[PDB]
Each structure stands twice: as structure tokens, then as C-alpha cells.
């Protein structure tokens, strides 16, 4: 029975082996997603996003006419974009170019077509009656994007728009109970419960969640953990998040709460190096300045042979730009050799930097043949600390 608990968690299954065994469960799980419905709603949200950008630009006095060329800074200064929001402002122009309203050569911008009248809020409500199931996303897009000009002009701290004290959950319902998040979060749970199904009765398991928010992904895991054999450290950079979560999860008695900034050495923050079996980071690692230093801090927490579970969006999204792209974390990135103009990585980029930062046996999920395109826009990545 008893082997020494000081020795590494050799009992953990391999991510590839976990992926193999869950494969039939995933082929049934991804068909529960509506191919057309989540595709329809995705396209329309990208069209709505344009409306919000045009609405916001006009409210700042945008007066540029077709053929006219302007400089990015000059336009920012004209419309009153505060200096810290010009990165976001550039991306909003890049989006107008994708749809043909603007064109870009050099760092100069030329108007192609005059933008027409928009009422994105009237159209938002239409979408809400059509698709009440994505109400969290439209409500949050409404609160953040219908205030874009306030944000670009620095009159609103976007934190109060995305994560105000009186409402941290709306941003979590997006991460937790959207159609796609339900699939991805179930994978996170099934992966974690499969990886540990060989845990000796003699040994406890230690999990640590980075950037856990108010527990969007956490809530999928906790119902399956064995309180007698588990320690679960709920961390976030913000104390308001851990405090709301402690309220939500108060009757799970095996939970620890603590604050962690994954951009600074976790050992300087009260965390033991290389003594966590499983690290969860859902939708957080991208929001840092250097993925290599961030992933090296993550690696520093993992026991030899321990498991990282990552949940990340992998594609550009205009409606996401109008919510989380308002925040500092979205544009923190400075590792331009890897991330030239957007904080997110695709599946192949994530595998690459993970192998460079001391991980192996990297799996990306789901990978099912006829799955919805929307399942290719997000991924669960499982990787093993390379002993
Ligand atoms: N540098 C950092 N270190 C740790 N957490 C961070 C961080 N920067 C941002 N975060 C946290 O990352 C979270 C992104 S939203 C949280 C998502 C969460 N997994 C959920 O499903 O609810 C925020 O709560 C934010 O506070």
C-alpha cells in the first residue's frame, strides 16, 4: 500500500493517456453543441460589434470622409483617445478595415466608405429575443461597448464595466454557461478526474487554480473532488474575486483561498515550489506581458510529472475585443517575436511555447471531426511537467 508521499506523483495518468480514454466521451459531448445556432450567433455578434465601434467613433466626433488619410496618433488626439487606450483604438480601426470601411497602408489610414446609421442597442435587444441563451454575452457586450467612447476617453475605468464590485458574475456566466463554455468546462473536469483515478488511498492530491475569477471553471470541478484526499487552492490576482468565490463555495471545506500574481515568482507570494499536482488556468495566462515568463512561473509550481490544464480562446473575436479588450491585461503583451499584435495564441503556438517552457505530452481538446467551428475557436490544453 504505502509508498513515500515525498516522492513525485508518479500515479498521475499521462495527458495523452487521459485524452485517449476520454475520447469516446468527447465525441458525444461535442455533438450536444448546436452547429448552426452557435455559428449563427457568433457571426451576428461580430456584425453587431462593428455597429458599436462606429457608434462609439461618431460619439467622439469622427468626421473623416472617403479618400481622406489620417495618422493613427493624430486621429487619437483628435477624438480624445487617452494615451493608454490607443492600442485598443488601433484594433478598432483594424476591425473597420476587415469589413472594408477603412484601409491601411504604412501606419496611415484612409477612409473607404462612409459608415451608415447604427442603433446597436436596438439590434442587441432583437438578438436577445432571438437568442435568450446568450443573454450574458449580449448584456455584457452592451454594458461595455455602448460605453466605448467613455472608455477610449478615459472617463470610465473599464474594470467598473467588466468587473464592478456589485457584479463580478456577469463576466463569469460568459465563461461558465455559454453553450461553448459548457462543453469546454466539462472537458476540464473530465480531464482532471481521469488524470487522478489512480491516486493511492495513502496520498492526497493538491490542485491549484490560477486566475479563477469567481469560479466559472471551478464550479465544474469541485462536485467531483474527494474532500478527504484533496486540497484545492483557489487563487486570483484580485481579492474581490477570492472573496466572492469563498461565499459561493463555503460548504466545500477542502478549499484554500489565496492571491497569486502569475507574472511574479509564486514562491515570493507564499506558494511552495514544485509541490502542486494539478494546475488549472482557465482564460488567464494570455493576459500577461510575457508568455514565456508566465509559463515558467506556472512550471515552477508543478510537481515533477504534474499536470497543467489550460482553457484558452484561440482566435480573434471582435465582440471579445469590446469586453476584455478594454482591460489592461489584453494589451500587456510585450513578447512580440511570439505575439505581434494580439494577446492570444492558436493551438499550434500554444504547443510550441509549452514545449519551450519545460512541458511535454501536450494535448489540445477537443479534436473531433465534424465538430462545430466554434469548438475550434477555443481549446483545453493538457500538458505534463517534464521531469
Ligand atoms: N497576472 C495575473 N495573475 C493571476 N490572475 C490574473 C492575472 N491577471 C488577471 N488575472 C485574473 O484572471 C481572471 C480572468 S476572468 C477569470 C476566468 C475564470 N477562470 C472564470 O472562469 O471565472 C480575472 O479574474 C483576473 O483577476
Short mmCIF file of C-alpha atoms and ligand atoms in Angstrom, two decimals:
data_model
loop_
_atom_site.label_atom_id
_atom_site.label_comp_id
_atom_site.label_asym_id
_atom_site.label_seq_id
_atom_site.Cartn_x
_atom_site.Cartn_y
_atom_site.Cartn_z
CA UNK A 1 0.00 0.00 0.00
CA UNK A 2 2.13 2.84 1.33
CA UNK A 3 4.88 4.38 -0.77
CA UNK A 4 6.54 7.58 0.38
CA UNK A 5 4.47 10.73 -0.23
CA UNK A 6 7.64 12.82 -0.51
CA UNK A 7 8.31 11.23 -3.91
CA UNK A 8 6.86 12.68 -7.14
CA UNK A 9 3.13 12.00 -8.22
CA UNK A 10 4.04 9.07 -10.48
CA UNK A 11 0.43 7.84 -10.11
CA UNK A 12 -0.99 10.63 -12.35
CA UNK A 13 -2.01 9.40 -15.77
CA UNK A 14 -0.27 10.85 -18.81
CA UNK A 15 -2.23 13.63 -20.61
CA UNK A 16 -2.11 11.62 -23.87
CA UNK A 17 -3.39 8.58 -21.97
CA UNK A 18 -6.13 10.68 -20.36
CA UNK A 19 -7.04 12.03 -23.81
CA UNK A 20 -7.24 8.52 -25.28
CA UNK A 21 -9.57 7.26 -22.53
CA UNK A 22 -11.89 10.28 -22.62
CA UNK A 23 -12.05 10.24 -26.46
CA UNK A 24 -15.43 8.43 -26.71
CA UNK A 25 -16.91 10.71 -24.04
CA UNK A 26 -15.76 13.77 -26.02
CA UNK A 27 -17.25 12.60 -29.31
CA UNK A 28 -20.67 12.53 -27.62
CA UNK A 29 -20.04 15.77 -25.71
CA UNK A 30 -19.31 17.94 -28.76
CA UNK A 31 -22.48 16.87 -30.58
CA UNK A 32 -24.54 18.40 -27.76
CA UNK A 33 -23.47 21.73 -29.29
CA UNK A 34 -25.70 23.20 -31.98
CA UNK A 35 -23.55 23.61 -35.10
CA UNK A 36 -25.78 26.19 -36.77
CA UNK A 37 -27.04 28.01 -33.67
CA UNK A 38 -23.66 28.84 -32.13
CA UNK A 39 -22.38 29.64 -35.62
CA UNK A 40 -25.30 31.97 -36.41
CA UNK A 41 -24.99 33.79 -33.08
CA UNK A 42 -21.23 34.12 -33.50
CA UNK A 43 -21.42 35.79 -36.91
CA UNK A 44 -24.14 38.21 -35.81
CA UNK A 45 -22.16 39.26 -32.72
CA UNK A 46 -19.23 40.07 -35.00
CA UNK A 47 -21.55 42.25 -37.12
CA UNK A 48 -23.05 43.90 -34.04
CA UNK A 49 -19.52 44.68 -32.82
CA UNK A 50 -18.91 46.86 -35.90
CA UNK A 51 -22.05 48.84 -35.08
CA UNK A 52 -20.75 49.55 -31.54
CA UNK A 53 -17.39 50.69 -32.91
CA UNK A 54 -18.99 53.02 -35.47
CA UNK A 55 -21.41 54.32 -32.81
CA UNK A 56 -18.51 54.96 -30.46
CA UNK A 57 -16.32 56.68 -33.04
CA UNK A 58 -19.15 59.02 -34.08
CA UNK A 59 -19.85 59.95 -30.45
CA UNK A 60 -16.23 61.14 -30.20
CA UNK A 61 -16.74 63.39 -33.23
CA UNK A 62 -15.33 61.21 -36.04
CA UNK A 63 -15.54 63.41 -39.12
CA UNK A 64 -13.28 61.70 -41.67
CA UNK A 65 -14.64 61.41 -45.20
CA UNK A 66 -13.84 58.95 -48.01
CA UNK A 67 -10.33 59.20 -49.58
CA UNK A 68 -9.11 61.24 -46.60
CA UNK A 69 -5.97 59.84 -44.98
CA UNK A 70 -5.06 60.28 -41.33
CA UNK A 71 -2.34 59.23 -38.91
CA UNK A 72 -3.14 56.88 -36.04
CA UNK A 73 -1.88 59.25 -33.32
CA UNK A 74 -3.40 62.38 -34.89
CA UNK A 75 -6.82 60.69 -35.00
CA UNK A 76 -6.44 59.51 -31.40
CA UNK A 77 -5.60 63.03 -30.27
CA UNK A 78 -8.47 64.49 -32.32
CA UNK A 79 -11.13 62.15 -30.93
CA UNK A 80 -9.67 62.44 -27.43
CA UNK A 81 -8.39 58.86 -27.01
CA UNK A 82 -6.42 58.85 -23.76
CA UNK A 83 -2.87 57.52 -24.35
CA UNK A 84 -3.44 54.19 -22.59
CA UNK A 85 -6.33 53.26 -24.90
CA UNK A 86 -4.66 53.81 -28.28
CA UNK A 87 -3.61 50.15 -28.65
CA UNK A 88 -7.30 49.26 -28.37
CA UNK A 89 -8.14 52.19 -30.67
CA UNK A 90 -5.79 50.79 -33.32
CA UNK A 91 -7.50 47.39 -33.18
CA UNK A 92 -10.90 49.05 -33.56
CA UNK A 93 -9.53 50.64 -36.75
CA UNK A 94 -8.14 47.27 -37.85
CA UNK A 95 -11.67 45.87 -37.46
CA UNK A 96 -13.19 48.63 -39.61
CA UNK A 97 -10.59 47.66 -42.22
CA UNK A 98 -11.57 43.96 -42.11
CA UNK A 99 -15.09 44.97 -43.16
CA UNK A 100 -13.88 47.44 -45.82
CA UNK A 101 -14.77 50.75 -44.13
CA UNK A 102 -11.09 51.65 -43.64
CA UNK A 103 -7.88 50.70 -45.41
CA UNK A 104 -4.35 50.75 -44.06
CA UNK A 105 -1.01 51.36 -45.75
CA UNK A 106 2.13 52.25 -43.81
CA UNK A 107 0.85 53.41 -40.39
CA UNK A 108 -1.62 55.72 -42.20
CA UNK A 109 -5.37 55.19 -42.51
CA UNK A 110 -7.67 56.12 -45.42
CA UNK A 111 -11.48 56.10 -45.29
CA UNK A 112 -13.04 53.86 -47.95
CA UNK A 113 -16.79 54.02 -47.25
CA UNK A 114 -18.92 56.32 -45.13
CA UNK A 115 -20.43 54.41 -42.20
CA UNK A 116 -24.26 54.37 -42.05
CA UNK A 117 -26.66 54.94 -39.16
CA UNK A 118 -26.47 52.31 -36.43
CA UNK A 119 -28.51 51.59 -33.33
CA UNK A 120 -26.59 48.63 -31.87
CA UNK A 121 -28.71 48.70 -28.70
CA UNK A 122 -31.97 48.31 -30.61
CA UNK A 123 -30.32 45.49 -32.55
CA UNK A 124 -28.89 43.97 -29.36
CA UNK A 125 -32.42 43.64 -27.97
CA UNK A 126 -33.57 41.98 -31.19
CA UNK A 127 -30.77 39.43 -30.77
CA UNK A 128 -31.74 38.92 -27.13
CA UNK A 129 -35.31 38.00 -28.01
CA UNK A 130 -33.99 35.68 -30.74
CA UNK A 131 -31.26 34.09 -28.58
CA UNK A 132 -32.09 34.48 -24.87
CA UNK A 133 -29.48 31.75 -24.20
CA UNK A 134 -26.52 34.09 -24.95
CA UNK A 135 -28.03 36.86 -22.80
CA UNK A 136 -24.94 37.05 -20.57
CA UNK A 137 -22.72 37.85 -23.56
CA UNK A 138 -25.08 40.41 -25.10
CA UNK A 139 -25.78 42.07 -21.76
CA UNK A 140 -22.07 42.39 -21.02
CA UNK A 141 -21.25 43.45 -24.57
CA UNK A 142 -23.97 46.08 -24.18
CA UNK A 143 -22.61 47.46 -20.89
CA UNK A 144 -19.01 47.59 -22.17
CA UNK A 145 -19.42 48.51 -25.85
CA UNK A 146 -22.21 51.04 -25.64
CA UNK A 147 -19.73 52.92 -23.40
CA UNK A 148 -16.75 52.60 -25.75
CA UNK A 149 -16.24 56.34 -26.22
CA UNK A 150 -16.23 56.88 -22.46
CA UNK A 151 -13.57 54.17 -22.21
CA UNK A 152 -11.40 55.48 -25.05
CA UNK A 153 -11.62 58.93 -23.46
CA UNK A 154 -10.55 57.51 -20.08
CA UNK A 155 -13.74 58.68 -18.36
CA UNK A 156 -14.53 55.11 -17.25
CA UNK A 157 -12.14 52.64 -15.72
CA UNK A 158 -13.11 49.61 -17.85
CA UNK A 159 -12.82 47.45 -14.70
CA UNK A 160 -16.09 49.01 -13.50
CA UNK A 161 -17.59 47.94 -16.83
CA UNK A 162 -16.25 44.38 -16.95
CA UNK A 163 -15.78 43.54 -13.23
CA UNK A 164 -17.61 46.05 -11.00
CA UNK A 165 -17.84 45.11 -7.32
CA UNK A 166 -21.65 44.78 -7.44
CA UNK A 167 -21.46 42.37 -10.41
CA UNK A 168 -18.46 40.10 -10.91
CA UNK A 169 -20.67 37.23 -12.05
CA UNK A 170 -21.87 38.55 -15.45
CA UNK A 171 -18.35 38.09 -16.83
CA UNK A 172 -18.32 34.62 -15.27
CA UNK A 173 -21.68 33.49 -16.73
CA UNK A 174 -19.97 34.18 -20.05
CA UNK A 175 -17.07 31.87 -19.08
CA UNK A 176 -19.30 29.28 -17.40
CA UNK A 177 -22.70 28.87 -19.05
CA UNK A 178 -22.31 29.91 -22.67
CA UNK A 179 -23.00 26.97 -24.99
CA UNK A 180 -19.32 26.57 -25.83
CA UNK A 181 -18.06 27.17 -22.29
CA UNK A 182 -20.29 24.33 -21.07
CA UNK A 183 -18.51 21.94 -23.43
CA UNK A 184 -15.03 23.24 -22.63
CA UNK A 185 -15.59 23.31 -18.87
CA UNK A 186 -16.92 19.75 -18.89
CA UNK A 187 -13.71 18.68 -20.66
CA UNK A 188 -11.67 20.41 -17.95
CA UNK A 189 -13.50 18.39 -15.29
CA UNK A 190 -13.41 15.06 -17.10
CA UNK A 191 -9.69 15.55 -17.75
CA UNK A 192 -8.91 16.29 -14.10
CA UNK A 193 -10.99 13.41 -12.76
CA UNK A 194 -9.42 10.99 -15.25
CA UNK A 195 -5.82 12.07 -14.56
CA UNK A 196 -6.17 11.20 -10.87
CA UNK A 197 -8.14 7.97 -10.98
CA UNK A 198 -5.06 6.08 -9.75
CA UNK A 199 -4.44 8.27 -6.65
CA UNK A 200 -3.35 5.88 -3.85
CA UNK A 201 -5.59 5.82 -0.78
CA UNK A 202 -2.38 6.76 1.08
CA UNK A 203 -1.79 10.04 -0.78
CA UNK A 204 -3.50 13.37 -1.09
CA UNK A 205 -3.76 15.39 -4.28
CA UNK A 206 -3.06 19.12 -4.48
CA UNK A 207 -4.70 21.28 -7.13
CA UNK A 208 -4.13 24.99 -7.66
CA UNK A 209 -6.22 27.25 -9.86
CA UNK A 210 -4.67 30.44 -11.32
CA UNK A 211 -6.86 33.41 -12.18
CA UNK A 212 -10.00 31.62 -11.02
CA UNK A 213 -12.23 34.72 -11.06
CA UNK A 214 -15.46 33.95 -9.23
CA UNK A 215 -15.27 30.25 -10.04
CA UNK A 216 -16.66 29.84 -13.56
CA UNK A 217 -14.48 26.84 -14.32
CA UNK A 218 -14.02 25.96 -10.63
CA UNK A 219 -17.70 25.13 -10.22
CA UNK A 220 -17.39 22.31 -12.75
CA UNK A 221 -14.59 20.58 -10.80
CA UNK A 222 -15.49 20.86 -7.12
CA UNK A 223 -18.52 18.50 -7.16
CA UNK A 224 -16.26 15.56 -8.17
CA UNK A 225 -13.29 16.01 -5.83
CA UNK A 226 -12.88 13.79 -2.75
CA UNK A 227 -12.62 16.18 0.24
CA UNK A 228 -10.76 13.50 2.25
CA UNK A 229 -7.98 13.32 -0.36
CA UNK A 230 -7.87 16.77 -1.97
CA UNK A 231 -6.51 20.25 -1.33
CA UNK A 232 -7.80 22.85 -3.79
CA UNK A 233 -6.14 26.29 -3.73
CA UNK A 234 -8.44 28.90 -5.29
CA UNK A 235 -6.32 31.86 -6.36
CA UNK A 236 -6.83 35.08 -8.29
CA UNK A 237 -4.82 38.26 -8.56
CA UNK A 238 -7.82 40.12 -7.10
CA UNK A 239 -9.04 39.72 -3.53
CA UNK A 240 -12.56 40.68 -4.61
CA UNK A 241 -12.68 37.53 -6.71
CA UNK A 242 -11.48 35.13 -4.00
CA UNK A 243 -13.88 36.75 -1.51
CA UNK A 244 -16.91 36.33 -3.77
CA UNK A 245 -15.87 32.73 -4.51
CA UNK A 246 -15.41 31.87 -0.83
CA UNK A 247 -19.04 32.93 -0.40
CA UNK A 248 -20.13 30.75 -3.34
CA UNK A 249 -18.08 27.72 -2.25
CA UNK A 250 -18.31 27.96 1.53
CA UNK A 251 -19.52 24.38 2.11
CA UNK A 252 -16.66 22.82 0.15
CA UNK A 253 -14.39 22.51 3.18
CA UNK A 254 -11.26 21.37 1.29
CA UNK A 255 -10.74 24.75 -0.46
CA UNK A 256 -7.95 27.16 0.32
CA UNK A 257 -8.08 30.77 -0.85
CA UNK A 258 -5.04 32.95 -1.60
CA UNK A 259 -3.97 35.64 -4.03
CA UNK A 260 -1.44 34.97 -6.76
CA UNK A 261 0.00 37.17 -9.49
CA UNK A 262 1.31 34.71 -12.07
CA UNK A 263 3.66 37.33 -13.52
CA UNK A 264 5.83 37.36 -10.38
CA UNK A 265 7.68 34.39 -8.87
CA UNK A 266 4.97 32.48 -6.91
CA UNK A 267 7.43 31.48 -4.20
CA UNK A 268 7.69 35.14 -3.23
CA UNK A 269 3.91 35.07 -2.71
CA UNK A 270 3.59 32.25 -0.19
CA UNK A 271 3.46 29.26 -2.58
CA UNK A 272 5.69 26.17 -2.37
CA UNK A 273 7.74 25.43 -5.48
CA UNK A 274 7.12 22.15 -7.34
CA UNK A 275 4.60 20.81 -4.85
CA UNK A 276 1.29 21.10 -6.75
CA UNK A 277 0.00 18.03 -8.63
CA UNK A 278 -2.51 19.83 -10.90
CA UNK A 279 -2.64 23.46 -12.02
CA UNK A 280 -5.75 24.90 -13.66
CA UNK A 281 -5.62 28.21 -15.57
CA UNK A 282 -8.84 29.00 -17.47
CA UNK A 283 -8.71 32.18 -19.59
CA UNK A 284 -5.93 33.99 -17.73
CA UNK A 285 -2.39 33.22 -18.94
CA UNK A 286 -2.84 35.28 -22.16
CA UNK A 287 -3.48 38.46 -20.14
CA UNK A 288 0.20 38.86 -19.20
CA UNK A 289 3.23 40.55 -20.71
CA UNK A 290 5.49 37.54 -21.50
CA UNK A 291 4.01 34.07 -22.00
CA UNK A 292 7.45 32.52 -21.50
CA UNK A 293 7.95 34.03 -18.05
CA UNK A 294 4.30 33.34 -17.21
CA UNK A 295 4.59 29.67 -18.23
CA UNK A 296 7.91 29.40 -16.39
CA UNK A 297 6.20 30.60 -13.20
CA UNK A 298 3.46 28.02 -13.84
CA UNK A 299 6.09 25.33 -14.35
CA UNK A 300 7.74 26.36 -11.07
CA UNK A 301 4.57 25.45 -9.17
CA UNK A 302 4.17 21.96 -10.69
CA UNK A 303 5.46 18.76 -9.17
CA UNK A 304 7.61 16.54 -11.42
CA UNK A 305 5.06 14.77 -13.62
CA UNK A 306 2.22 17.10 -12.56
CA UNK A 307 -0.43 18.31 -14.97
CA UNK A 308 -1.29 21.76 -16.35
CA UNK A 309 -4.85 22.26 -17.62
CA UNK A 310 -5.33 25.38 -19.76
CA UNK A 311 -8.55 26.77 -21.20
CA UNK A 312 -7.91 29.46 -23.80
CA UNK A 313 -9.58 31.21 -26.68
CA UNK A 314 -7.52 30.76 -29.83
CA UNK A 315 -8.98 33.16 -32.40
CA UNK A 316 -9.55 36.88 -32.79
CA UNK A 317 -13.05 37.95 -31.79
CA UNK A 318 -14.40 41.47 -32.24
CA UNK A 319 -17.03 41.16 -29.52
CA UNK A 320 -14.37 39.90 -27.11
CA UNK A 321 -12.15 42.85 -28.03
CA UNK A 322 -15.04 45.12 -26.93
CA UNK A 323 -15.24 43.48 -23.46
CA UNK A 324 -11.90 42.08 -22.25
CA UNK A 325 -10.04 44.21 -24.80
CA UNK A 326 -10.95 47.26 -22.73
CA UNK A 327 -8.77 45.96 -19.88
CA UNK A 328 -5.04 46.45 -19.29
CA UNK A 329 -4.31 42.72 -19.41
CA UNK A 330 -5.40 42.38 -23.03
CA UNK A 331 -2.64 44.71 -24.29
CA UNK A 332 0.04 43.98 -21.70
CA UNK A 333 1.89 41.64 -24.05
CA UNK A 334 5.42 42.59 -25.00
CA UNK A 335 6.81 39.30 -26.43
CA UNK A 336 6.33 40.50 -29.99
CA UNK A 337 8.51 37.77 -31.55
CA UNK A 338 5.69 35.43 -30.46
CA UNK A 339 2.69 37.81 -30.18
CA UNK A 340 3.00 40.75 -32.63
CA UNK A 341 -0.45 42.31 -32.33
CA UNK A 342 -2.89 40.18 -30.24
CA UNK A 343 -2.62 38.54 -26.80
CA UNK A 344 -3.98 35.10 -27.83
CA UNK A 345 -2.23 32.07 -29.34
CA UNK A 346 -3.64 29.33 -31.55
CA UNK A 347 -3.35 25.59 -30.77
CA UNK A 348 -0.03 25.17 -32.60
CA UNK A 349 1.50 28.25 -30.97
CA UNK A 350 0.48 27.04 -27.53
CA UNK A 351 2.10 23.63 -28.09
CA UNK A 352 5.29 25.36 -29.19
CA UNK A 353 5.80 27.69 -26.25
CA UNK A 354 4.76 24.93 -23.82
CA UNK A 355 7.48 22.66 -25.17
CA UNK A 356 9.95 25.56 -24.84
CA UNK A 357 8.99 26.19 -21.19
CA UNK A 358 9.55 22.67 -19.82
CA UNK A 359 6.30 20.88 -20.67
CA UNK A 360 5.76 17.66 -22.66
CA UNK A 361 2.94 15.35 -23.76
CA UNK A 362 0.85 18.33 -24.84
CA UNK A 363 -2.76 17.60 -25.80
CA UNK A 364 -5.28 20.02 -27.30
CA UNK A 365 -9.00 19.39 -26.91
CA UNK A 366 -11.42 18.84 -28.43
CA UNK A 367 -10.25 17.31 -31.79
CA UNK A 368 -13.36 15.70 -33.25
CA UNK A 369 -14.01 15.53 -36.99
CA UNK A 370 -17.42 17.09 -37.53
CA UNK A 371 -17.35 19.38 -34.53
CA UNK A 372 -18.68 22.93 -34.67
CA UNK A 373 -16.29 25.59 -35.94
CA UNK A 374 -16.90 27.35 -32.61
CA UNK A 375 -15.14 24.40 -30.88
CA UNK A 376 -12.02 25.21 -32.94
CA UNK A 377 -12.03 28.79 -31.61
CA UNK A 378 -11.42 27.61 -28.03
CA UNK A 379 -9.28 24.81 -26.65
CA UNK A 380 -8.49 22.89 -23.50
CA UNK A 381 -4.76 22.18 -23.41
CA UNK A 382 -3.37 19.47 -21.13
CA UNK A 383 0.39 19.23 -20.59
CA UNK A 384 2.81 17.48 -18.27
CA UNK A 385 5.68 19.00 -16.35
CA UNK A 386 8.82 17.47 -17.87
CA UNK A 387 10.68 15.58 -15.13
N1 LIG B 1 -1.45 38.41 -13.59
C1 LIG B 1 -2.47 37.68 -13.14
N2 LIG B 1 -2.25 36.65 -12.25
C2 LIG B 1 -3.29 35.89 -11.77
N3 LIG B 1 -4.56 36.17 -12.17
C3 LIG B 1 -4.80 37.17 -13.06
C4 LIG B 1 -3.76 37.94 -13.55
N4 LIG B 1 -4.28 38.86 -14.39
C5 LIG B 1 -5.62 38.69 -14.46
N5 LIG B 1 -5.95 37.65 -13.64
C6 LIG B 1 -7.30 37.13 -13.39
O1 LIG B 1 -7.75 36.38 -14.48
C7 LIG B 1 -9.16 36.32 -14.44
C8 LIG B 1 -9.71 36.32 -15.87
S1 LIG B 1 -11.51 36.20 -15.88
C9 LIG B 1 -11.44 34.75 -14.82
C10 LIG B 1 -11.80 33.46 -15.54
C11 LIG B 1 -12.09 32.38 -14.52
N6 LIG B 1 -11.24 31.23 -14.78
C12 LIG B 1 -13.57 32.03 -14.57
O2 LIG B 1 -13.97 31.13 -15.31
O3 LIG B 1 -14.40 32.66 -13.89
C13 LIG B 1 -9.64 37.55 -13.65
O4 LIG B 1 -10.42 37.18 -12.53
C14 LIG B 1 -8.34 38.23 -13.25
O5 LIG B 1 -8.43 38.75 -11.94
#
